[PDB]
Amino acid sequence: AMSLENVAFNVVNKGHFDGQQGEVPVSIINNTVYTKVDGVDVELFENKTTLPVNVAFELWAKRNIKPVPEVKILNNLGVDIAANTVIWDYKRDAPAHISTIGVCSMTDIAKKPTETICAPLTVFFDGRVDGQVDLFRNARNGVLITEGSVKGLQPSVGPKQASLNGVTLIGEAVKTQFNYYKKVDGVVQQLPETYFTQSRNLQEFKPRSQMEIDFLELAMDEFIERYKLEGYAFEHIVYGDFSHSQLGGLHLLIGLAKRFKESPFELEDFIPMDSTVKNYFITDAQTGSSKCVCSVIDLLLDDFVEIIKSQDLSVVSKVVKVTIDYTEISFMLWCKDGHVETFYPKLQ
Amino acid sequence: AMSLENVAFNVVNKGHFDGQQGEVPVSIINNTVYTKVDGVDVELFENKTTLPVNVAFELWAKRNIKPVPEVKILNNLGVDIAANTVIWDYKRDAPAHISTIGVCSMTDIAKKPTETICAPLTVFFDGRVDGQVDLFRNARNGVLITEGSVKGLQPSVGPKQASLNGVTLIGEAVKTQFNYYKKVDGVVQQLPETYFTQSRNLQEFKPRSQMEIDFLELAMDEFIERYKLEGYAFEHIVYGDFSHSQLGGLHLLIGLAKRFKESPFELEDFIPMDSTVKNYFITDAQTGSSKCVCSVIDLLLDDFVEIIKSQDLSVVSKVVKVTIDYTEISFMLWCKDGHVETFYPKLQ
Amino acid sequence: AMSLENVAFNVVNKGHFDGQQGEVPVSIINNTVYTKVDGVDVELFENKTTLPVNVAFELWAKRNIKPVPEVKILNNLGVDIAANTVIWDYKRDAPAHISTIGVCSMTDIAKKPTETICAPLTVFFDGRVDGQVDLFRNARNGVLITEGSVKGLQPSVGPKQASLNGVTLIGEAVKTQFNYYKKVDGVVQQLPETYFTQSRNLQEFKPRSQMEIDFLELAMDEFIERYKLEGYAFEHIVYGDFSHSQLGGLHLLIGLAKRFKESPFELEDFIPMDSTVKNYFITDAQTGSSKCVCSVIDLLLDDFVEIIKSQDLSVVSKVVKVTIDYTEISFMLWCKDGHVETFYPKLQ
Amino acid sequence: AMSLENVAFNVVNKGHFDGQQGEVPVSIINNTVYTKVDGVDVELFENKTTLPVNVAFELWAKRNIKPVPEVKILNNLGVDIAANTVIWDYKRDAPAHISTIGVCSMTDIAKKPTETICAPLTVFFDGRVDGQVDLFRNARNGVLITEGSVKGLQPSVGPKQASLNGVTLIGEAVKTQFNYYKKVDGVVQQLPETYFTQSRNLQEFKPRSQMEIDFLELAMDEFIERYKLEGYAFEHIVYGDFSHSQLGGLHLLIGLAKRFKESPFELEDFIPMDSTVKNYFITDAQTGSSKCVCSVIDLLLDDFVEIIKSQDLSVVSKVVKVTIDYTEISFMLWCKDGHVETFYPKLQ
Amino acid sequence: AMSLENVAFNVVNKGHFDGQQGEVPVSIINNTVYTKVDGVDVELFENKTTLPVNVAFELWAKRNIKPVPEVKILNNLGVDIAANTVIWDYKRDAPAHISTIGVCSMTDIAKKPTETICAPLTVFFDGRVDGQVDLFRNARNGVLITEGSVKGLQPSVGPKQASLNGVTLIGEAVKTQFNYYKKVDGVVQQLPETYFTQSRNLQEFKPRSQMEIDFLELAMDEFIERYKLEGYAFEHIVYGDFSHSQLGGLHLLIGLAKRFKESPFELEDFIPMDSTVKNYFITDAQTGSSKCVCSVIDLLLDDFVEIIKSQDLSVVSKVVKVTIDYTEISFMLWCKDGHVETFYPKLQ
Numbered sequence A, B, C, D, E: 001a002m003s004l005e006n007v008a009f010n011v012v013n014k015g016h017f018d019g020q021q022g023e024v025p026v027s028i029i030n031n032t033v034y035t036k037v038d039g040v041d042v043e044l045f046e047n048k049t050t051l052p053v054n055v056a057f058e059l060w061a062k063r064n065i066k067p068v069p070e071v072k073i074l075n076n077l078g079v080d081i082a083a084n085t086v087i088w089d090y091k092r093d094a095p096a097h098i099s100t101i102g103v104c105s106m107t108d109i110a111k112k113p114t115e116t117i118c119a120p121l122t123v124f125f126d127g128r129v130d131g132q133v134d135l136f137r138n139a140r141n142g143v144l145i146t147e148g149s150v151k152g153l154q155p156s157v158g159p160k161q162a163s164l165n166g167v168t169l170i171g172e173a174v175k176t177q178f179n180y181y182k183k184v185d186g187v188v189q190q191l192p193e194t195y196f197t198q199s200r201n202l203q204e205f206k207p208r209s210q211m212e213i214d215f216l217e218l219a220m221d222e223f224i225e226r227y228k229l230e231g232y233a234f235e236h237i238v239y240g241d242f243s244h245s246q247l248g249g250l251h252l253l254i255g256l257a258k259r260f261k262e263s264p265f266e267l268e269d270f271i272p273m274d275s276t277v278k279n280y281f282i283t284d285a286q287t288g289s290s291k292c293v294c295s296v297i298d299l300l301l302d303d304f305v306e307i308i309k310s311q312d313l314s315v316v317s318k319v320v321k322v323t324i325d326y327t328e329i330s331f332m333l334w335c336k337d338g339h340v341e342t343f344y345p346k347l348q
């Protein structure tokens, strides 16, 4: 027996929806859910979604609290809906998916993913839940994650990191690296070879290779010399050029993290959502150098070096396609006299 | 187990809260409660109260659906709260009382009127509900209504009419005339002798005596002659004077109803609530004669004639107090040479 | 190039969306759309839907302005969505369907009904629009209306009335009687033989047969005598019993219209939407007789007489299923000694 | 000392702002102003304007309660703002003008119309207020109304009717016919000779000449014969043609009032404001004949007959400009063989 | 003469309500109060309370700006209301109490605490205000704070810290340590022996004893050895166990502060209010170890050591009650073979 008061009871006593019986007094005002605690109203939830406040509150309470794939991975794999869970999108403060299956009476399109309404949708299945590997085997369209091997199915090793309650982390106490599987029209897909973005933050950026440690510690000319990067325009692309009114390059998160230690800058996240490539309106506070659309990707510096060193540098401009997070990312590569001028994730 | 979904289930299936088990999906957006009916949202309630939308919806669903005293009578008797019911104020589209007793977890100050918090409040008790006469006997402060005799308790015969689902009526299939009782500080109070307002509408006004039939049918000068009303200023007070920019008199509802048949006028109800005396900003459409504060009372014309004919007409101006609906209504009486000039409910 | 300003330009200059080029300044505040007219804001639309204000405004502007089936008929036939039009539900002040096809970028699930997303949905097709009969022939699920014969397709003669801009009418200058067709899972479905509700209002009720003229003019006992209705409980079912606290019978709109001429009553439409059977919380103003859930259906009195006279009256209680507006309506029939006690649309 | 609480005190005790000292407790929630009356909240004002709720409440409380020109006349004369008053637009439930002069601290652009900010604005002045004729004489731009002669100023006799608290009326107890004067760039402007619209409603339409009495009582062919209107297409223009899907003509309010007595129709006022010519999306309920943009003007039938009989009928199509309510109204006149086919206020 | 404009004038010129005369222009939009400063709107207050925006703005302006007891202390002492002040709850951004006494006309239940409505309520009295010690002496129910001795009354030494404008601090320039007194039904209570929580923040945690300095500086095994804490499960309870998917222990704020220096973690404050024990949904960013309901108390480590070393360790599980901040806190104590396994504030 689902109810607003029961959802609020679960949030108050269990920190989230935990199927417990009970009710607390609730008041809804505008887009906020409150509960009465000893005579006064205490805020439980502020709706930042486009769904009705009581519906968003229920989906948020019913969010998956285990490490789950980051929303950008699910989106890149064409995931439409999740089987009997809510993947909460912490970047948008909203459900990752419009509809649900066996979660909430207002958003449910089905109670089980075997209902014919789900057959054309790519349903997310989680092998850590009993019966979901079997549901994926019988589903026409779906994406499955598992911690280990699935008999007969060939896996795709996913990223090392996963999202746990909005914290992206590489699990030590929990497993965050999943095997991925995908089916389109009843046929198990062969997921492509892919690089993965590292999902790091600017303020707490940590290197994940000796090359990344060297990038952060060494001076620009020492690093470029050590890794034989002359002619690859890392001065522009990675370090950034703050000498003109338009900020040059600065498309790799590691370069922004290095700059951030020396001096701050504003990053306007004008489309705030999870995506493989992010676009920011950047203003460098020290110089006043700025760029309306600065595309930024967090690749491991070694992967970015491998990508740029695997390109033909004989044409003025061309599109370089790279599978990253299972999706095809277009980069614009500009060359002159056999050397790179710029290389950036395409603002298409 | 009270819940928003259960309240909505009761509204959808029973027309109001009826203690039935069940749930319907609900969505709350802004101040409106909706339910899903075959794929689309259907409005169940629009909150016009100052309470949270889900709380007002529950109180409205739990409204008393038996004939109950009109809110003006309850207000006049000093009723603060009701015992285990909601008196819905249809004139304000809101609960008649801020708090509840044994109704709703958000508004309840107690579950039973015997709780010490209720002792200073004048609690409304309904003798038609088992145990409520006994609860009145043990209450420090309260107002009780009954359909019959209570042993040892001296009654006050209330008005003929009561409100049933917002319709004021004199019951034929149901009893609407109640005995009234009141207690203050543990002591039974003698309710005063009183007139009662008739609670009629302008558009569907019906006469309730031969004098009222004669007022509506006869011309002004022949009605005044027939009932020997010369010198009582009925021309001004009751018929109304539309000859000057300021509308003169027009303080009896019957006079407004007579005028309404001939020509329309605007009545701005600038304090829209139930009260013994109503104030309107009136604009006569035919003449343009208007008055910002025109006090209007719906007394039976015979009662108004009895009141005005029982006054001493020897002083220029004085306050005449008349008990109406259990409250002392102040009237301003203006005389000249032994005749009335005006008589109106005194604008406080 | 669709835009809020272009939609508002069309509303201001064409009375609705008419595909015209142009823009007017618009301001959105809360749930209302305004436009500037010579310096001041003028309201164009107040959103009463659960969709975003600018989206609801666009769907309302793009509403079908030809006579279309009443929403209750579309709901009864299982219509989920319309092909390249918006059926505006004037009873709910909202789109009849959640999603659109080729109408609005925010609500569209497809641009054409041939897209695979539309295959499981019952799409409404209108033969008066070029190519829509062909689209119905190729659709997996759908309901089609036409003004004439479709080769090889067996028709179902629909109701005489249709809705034109929220006015239900039997067209004289326009055709409102359509042929109906339906497909389920790619297979043309035979629509059942059905009665149709008359879609009349209480305040402007007009008789549509000599029996209905006689019901409204004749006294109860002489109408029952003239039409040999003794033993069919029309006194209870149709005329209504206002003698007890619970209002008895009163399930036919014509009986409510007859009562309405004599004395008024309140009809609380607690689920305000279009449906074959309506439920009202009724309070009779004259007697105080009331009923929380009074099911009411507007059948032609002759059709109701035909239905009730075609039943076996030998059992205490039973369910009688009658096809009305293409839906199976359950009725509860209560008998005693070979006579009817009551017959009413069964409260589900 | 202006304040929200003082404005509310004035509304509660005086029916509007009357400069009285005092305060009442107020609560603002969403767009509604409430006051506490014996423990419960009572609604004083619901903001339907695009201004902040407390600001709109103050302007509405400070509305002019004397007969004032109808907003369409003020708009037609180019009035931007009023001197030390608020002209409340009852058709829009909003101030007729965005800014104020000496009324409200939030909307004031000046305290007196002599401030240089008012020089480019056409300020409305009211000769019934002391000093306002002198203020008009010194204003660069303005419109003045008076009840009598202003020395040396040539007057324009305005309409017979004025708006008093939202009621348009021809005053008997008050004067509603004003002399009008206008200044542009410091120069007194000669107001043109004009017809005036009658400002009548469909439901309470009253004839104002013997020709109008004859139009409403006589049959179409005998009225046309009596007034020698053969060849002037009154059958189409005034009576209306309900025979085709598109409703023909019906551009004079009197014709809509005649039709209304026989059968109802829907008039969608899609730009709800006061204007000389109104546009409606009309749906005739009896026939289903409809028109998205039906321009309607309320001229005295005699004035419309005078206008149409003063035109040259020798050209297929042409624009006929007629001064109505001080504005040039364009009409489209279509002729064939020396007879009128149609004549309507040209849809701009 | 209280008013919205006067409250706003005080906020603009005095930083809070200071009883100064004056008015500023104000606009209210949604839940925000603005004032016009040289032509533009400037935000003064955003309502995060469940009260009307203008009422919450007034109570916030009238907040107590002296050091006052933290809301958790007032709540633990059963405080219902304050005498002639507003205790602003900075953790909820709302008044600590629903009603007021002599503060605001919308929330006042009385002007003075001697009114009979206040007699059953526990009124907060402040000895720093003239006459409030005497008001406490005559009150039936109340809590009094003083800086020094009250003749005849025995004091309870309160916490060292108090809240000054939402900053919890141990005053050096001001006195924050108060004597507490409480009366229930006219009887001066003997307040129990109690520990006090330290009200520290995670980010700016400072040790308040040599044991706390040693906890933060020393390694886990060195500290446990130095203070002879073997067998008391400090490894689990205080340091925290981040090795399993469920985060173990971590119930003392000092342990969270130590962890915070090494690596960050998310603390979801799902019931955001002031309380002796706080519950957080914690996610450790380094390991991914998490716990839905991690109860956390900020006790001085010496007090926690004294509490845990004063328990009988011979039973598997039992409830240990400890008076903290004047309230009874239940702890769950789990033992095995004479050693502690866990000890935590009970999630009841």
Ligand SMILES: NCCCc1ncc[nH]1
Residues within 6 Å of the ligand: A075, A078, A079, A080
């Ligand atoms: N954000 C949801 C993506 C779902 C999808 N992918 C392709 C089509 N639909």
Ligand SMILES: NCCCc1ncc[nH]1
Residues within 6 Å of the ligand: A037, A038, A039, A040, E075, E078, E079, E080
């Ligand atoms: N948060 C207010 C507490 C007041 C109280 N304590 C006990 C009863 N009421």
